[PDB]
Swiss-Prot record:
Basic and acidic residues bias: start-end ranges: 109-125
Region (Disordered): 109-129
List of residues binding Ca(2+): 15, 34-35
Active-site residues, Swiss-Prot/TrEMBL: 29, 37, 75
Compartments in which it is found: Secreted
Name by which UniProt lists this protein: Nuclease A
Region of the whole protein represented: 89 to 223 of 231
């Protein structure tokens, strides 16, 4: 897998971020995670956590996995990095996302994220509290 440039356009919610990628606006849906909707418990905290992380970064990158790069809604499917730190893993490590939507061939970082979820759950963080 390879990191590619993108620039933030807008943080949308805990697991959706609009970016400019190869010069075009695209909504990205973060691989392998599920954050609560804004209207559910922890939904506002997940949205806030992703927002701060992408807005504060000097460098945003996207990393596609080995399979499909867009979902049925036209959203990009990628891992998102903010100053080299993976937002997907960070949300899971903080108990603000569950590992979810693990489809074969887009699951390179599955075990990394499950490990983060185990530790969030051991700490009883947020969703796991
Ligand atoms: C994360 C992800 C979601 N999706 C689709 C599955 C779900 O379809 P349905 O909309 O039919 O439930 C939806 C979940 O996204 P959200 O969690 O953003 O709603 O996005 C993919 O197809 N591949 C993916 O990797
Ligand atoms: Ca969601």
């Amino acid at each position: 897998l390879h990191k590619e440039p993108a620039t933030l356009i807008k943080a949308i919610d805990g697991d959706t971020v609009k970016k400019m990628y190869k010069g075009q606006p695209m909504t990205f849906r973060l691989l392998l995670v599920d954050t609560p909707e804004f209207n559910e418990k922890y939904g506002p905290e997940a949205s806030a956590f992703t927002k701060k992380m992408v807005e504060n970064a000097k460098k945003i990158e996207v990393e596609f996995d080995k399979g499909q790069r867009t979902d049925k809604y036209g959203r990009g499917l990628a891992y998102t990095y903010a100053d080299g730190k993976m937002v997907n893993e960070a949300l899971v490590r903080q108990g603000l996302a569950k590992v979810a939507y693990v489809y074969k061939g887009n699951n390179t970082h599955e075990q990394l994220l499950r490990k983060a979820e185990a530790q969030a759950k051991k700490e009883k963080l947020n969703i796991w509290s």
